[PDB]
PDB file of C-alpha atoms (C1' of nucleotides) in Angstrom:
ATOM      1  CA  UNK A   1     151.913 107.351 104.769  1.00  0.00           C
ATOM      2  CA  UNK A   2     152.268 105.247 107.887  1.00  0.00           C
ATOM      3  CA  UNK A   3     148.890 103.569 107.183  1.00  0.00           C
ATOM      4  CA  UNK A   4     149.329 103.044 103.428  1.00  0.00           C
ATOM      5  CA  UNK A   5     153.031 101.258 104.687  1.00  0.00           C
ATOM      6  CA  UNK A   6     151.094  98.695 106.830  1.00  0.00           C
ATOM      7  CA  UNK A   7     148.228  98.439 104.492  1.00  0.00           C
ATOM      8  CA  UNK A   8     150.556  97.045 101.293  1.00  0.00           C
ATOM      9  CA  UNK A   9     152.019  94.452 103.587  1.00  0.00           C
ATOM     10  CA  UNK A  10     148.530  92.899 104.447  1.00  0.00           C
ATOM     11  CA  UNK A  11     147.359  93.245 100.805  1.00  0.00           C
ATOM     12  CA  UNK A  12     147.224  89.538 100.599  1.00  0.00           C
ATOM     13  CA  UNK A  13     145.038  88.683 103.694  1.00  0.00           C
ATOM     14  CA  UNK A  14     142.193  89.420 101.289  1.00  0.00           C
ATOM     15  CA  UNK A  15     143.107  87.006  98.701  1.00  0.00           C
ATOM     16  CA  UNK A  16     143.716  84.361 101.266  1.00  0.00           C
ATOM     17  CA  UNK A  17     140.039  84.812 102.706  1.00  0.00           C
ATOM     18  CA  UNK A  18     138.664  85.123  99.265  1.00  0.00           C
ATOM     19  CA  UNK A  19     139.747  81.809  98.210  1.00  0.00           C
ATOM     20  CA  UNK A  20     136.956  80.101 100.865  1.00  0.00           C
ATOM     21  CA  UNK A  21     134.648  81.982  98.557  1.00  0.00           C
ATOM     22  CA  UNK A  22     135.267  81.647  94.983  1.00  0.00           C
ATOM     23  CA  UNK A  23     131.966  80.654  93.241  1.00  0.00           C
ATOM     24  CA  UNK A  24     129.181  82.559  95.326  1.00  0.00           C
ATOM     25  CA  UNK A  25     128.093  84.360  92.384  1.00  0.00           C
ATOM     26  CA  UNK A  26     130.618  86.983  92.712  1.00  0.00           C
ATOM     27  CA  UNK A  27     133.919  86.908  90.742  1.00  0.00           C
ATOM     28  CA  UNK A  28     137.513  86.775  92.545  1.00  0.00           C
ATOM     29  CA  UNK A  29     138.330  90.641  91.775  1.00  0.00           C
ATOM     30  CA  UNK A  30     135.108  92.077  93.415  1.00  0.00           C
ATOM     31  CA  UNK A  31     135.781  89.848  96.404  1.00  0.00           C
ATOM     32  CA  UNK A  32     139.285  91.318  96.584  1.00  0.00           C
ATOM     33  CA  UNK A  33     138.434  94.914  96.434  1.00  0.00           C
ATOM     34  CA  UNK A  34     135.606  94.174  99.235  1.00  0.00           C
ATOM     35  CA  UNK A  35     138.375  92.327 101.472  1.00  0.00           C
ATOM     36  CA  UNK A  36     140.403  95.296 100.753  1.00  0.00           C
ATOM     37  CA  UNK A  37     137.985  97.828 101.632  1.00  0.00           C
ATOM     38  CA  UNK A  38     137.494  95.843 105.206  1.00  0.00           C
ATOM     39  CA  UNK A  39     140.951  95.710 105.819  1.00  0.00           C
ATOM     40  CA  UNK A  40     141.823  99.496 105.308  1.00  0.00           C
ATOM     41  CA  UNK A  41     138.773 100.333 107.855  1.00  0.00           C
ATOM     42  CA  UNK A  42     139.964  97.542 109.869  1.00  0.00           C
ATOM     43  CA  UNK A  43     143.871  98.391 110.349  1.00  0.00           C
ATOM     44  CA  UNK A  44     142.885 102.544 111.897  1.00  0.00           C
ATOM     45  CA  UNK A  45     140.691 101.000 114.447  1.00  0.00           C
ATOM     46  CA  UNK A  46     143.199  98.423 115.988  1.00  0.00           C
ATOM     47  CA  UNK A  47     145.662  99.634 118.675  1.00  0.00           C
ATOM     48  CA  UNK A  48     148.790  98.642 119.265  1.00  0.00           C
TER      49      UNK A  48
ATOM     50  C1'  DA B   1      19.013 126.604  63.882  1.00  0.00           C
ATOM     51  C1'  DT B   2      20.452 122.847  67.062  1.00  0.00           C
ATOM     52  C1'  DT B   3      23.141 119.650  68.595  1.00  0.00           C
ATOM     53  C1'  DT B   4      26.029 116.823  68.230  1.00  0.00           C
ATOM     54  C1'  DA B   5      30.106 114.959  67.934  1.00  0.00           C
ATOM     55  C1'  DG B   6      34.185 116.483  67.803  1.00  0.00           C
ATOM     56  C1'  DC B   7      38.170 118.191  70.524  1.00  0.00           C
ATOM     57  C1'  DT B   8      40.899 117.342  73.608  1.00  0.00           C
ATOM     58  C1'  DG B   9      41.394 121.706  77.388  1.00  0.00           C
ATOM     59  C1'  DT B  10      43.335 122.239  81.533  1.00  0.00           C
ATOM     60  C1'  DA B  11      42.378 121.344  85.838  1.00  0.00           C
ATOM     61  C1'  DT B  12      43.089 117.897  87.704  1.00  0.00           C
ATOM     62  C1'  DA B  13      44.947 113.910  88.245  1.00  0.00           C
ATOM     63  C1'  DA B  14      48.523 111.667  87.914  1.00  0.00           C
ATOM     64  C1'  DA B  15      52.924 111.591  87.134  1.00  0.00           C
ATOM     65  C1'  DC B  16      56.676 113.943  87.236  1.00  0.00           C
ATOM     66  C1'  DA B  17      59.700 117.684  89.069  1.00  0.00           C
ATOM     67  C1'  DT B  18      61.875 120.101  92.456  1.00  0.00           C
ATOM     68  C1'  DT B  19      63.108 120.834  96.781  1.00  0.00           C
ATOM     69  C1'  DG B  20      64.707 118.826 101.023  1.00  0.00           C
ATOM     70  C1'  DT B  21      66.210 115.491 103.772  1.00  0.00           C
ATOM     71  C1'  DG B  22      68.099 111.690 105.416  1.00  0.00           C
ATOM     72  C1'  DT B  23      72.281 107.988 104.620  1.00  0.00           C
ATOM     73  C1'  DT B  24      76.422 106.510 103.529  1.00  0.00           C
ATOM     74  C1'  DA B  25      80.282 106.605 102.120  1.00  0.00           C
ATOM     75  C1'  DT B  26      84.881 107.793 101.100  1.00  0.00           C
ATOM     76  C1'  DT B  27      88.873 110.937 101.162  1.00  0.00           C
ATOM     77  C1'  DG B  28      91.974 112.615 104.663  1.00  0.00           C
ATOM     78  C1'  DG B  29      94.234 111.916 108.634  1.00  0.00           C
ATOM     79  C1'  DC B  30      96.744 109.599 112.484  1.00  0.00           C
ATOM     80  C1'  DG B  31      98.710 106.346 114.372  1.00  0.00           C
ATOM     81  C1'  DT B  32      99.731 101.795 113.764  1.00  0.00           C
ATOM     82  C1'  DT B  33     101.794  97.505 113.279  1.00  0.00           C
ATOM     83  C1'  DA B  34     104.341  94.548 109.866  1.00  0.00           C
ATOM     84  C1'  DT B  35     109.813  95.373 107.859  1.00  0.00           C
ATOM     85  C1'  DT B  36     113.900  96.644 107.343  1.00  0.00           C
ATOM     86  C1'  DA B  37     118.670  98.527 107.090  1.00  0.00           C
ATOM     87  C1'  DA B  38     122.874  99.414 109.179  1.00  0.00           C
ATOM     88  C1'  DG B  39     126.353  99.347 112.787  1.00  0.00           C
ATOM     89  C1'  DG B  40     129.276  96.349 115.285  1.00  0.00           C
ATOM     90  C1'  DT B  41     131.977  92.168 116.299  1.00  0.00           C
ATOM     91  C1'  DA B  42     138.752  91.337 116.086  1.00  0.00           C
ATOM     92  C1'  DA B  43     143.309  83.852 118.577  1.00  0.00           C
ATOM     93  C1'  DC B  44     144.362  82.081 113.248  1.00  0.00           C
ATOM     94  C1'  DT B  45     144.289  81.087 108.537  1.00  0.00           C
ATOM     95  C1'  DT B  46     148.009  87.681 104.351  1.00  0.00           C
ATOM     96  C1'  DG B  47     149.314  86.275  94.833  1.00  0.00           C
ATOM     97  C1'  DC B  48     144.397  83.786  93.656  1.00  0.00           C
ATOM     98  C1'  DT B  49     141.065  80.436  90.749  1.00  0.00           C
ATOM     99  C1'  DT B  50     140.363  78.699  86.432  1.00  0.00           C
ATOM    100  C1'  DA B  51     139.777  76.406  82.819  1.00  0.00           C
ATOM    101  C1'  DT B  52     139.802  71.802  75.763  1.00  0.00           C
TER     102       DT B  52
END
DNA sequence: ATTTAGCTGTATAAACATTGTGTTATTGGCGTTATTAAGGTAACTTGCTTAT
């Protein structure tokens, strides 16, 4: 629950590094779901 | 009758045939080098584009 809390709040990080990216061959909504699978692995390791 | 010409006989000769023997060659195998994939990395940029 505590993860999932900070998680929603940085749902947009992903959309604001997918916009450097936009016409690489992949389409904006696989680009979002592979920012958001980074940052959910991402936010566990990181200590406060 | 006699032999003569006819007939190829089968040994032999020759050729083949069989056996043996060499050779080599390739599969397998092993290890080998090319290759490659993934993990990891943490100033900061936290609702998009994208279009007759």
């Amino acid at each position: 629950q505590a993860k999932k809390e900070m998680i929603e709040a940085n749902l947009r990080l992903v959309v604001s590094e997918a916009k450097k990216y936009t016409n690489r061959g992949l389409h904006f909504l696989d680009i979002i779901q592979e920012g958001n699978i980074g940052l959910m692995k991402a936010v566990d390791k990181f200590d406060y």
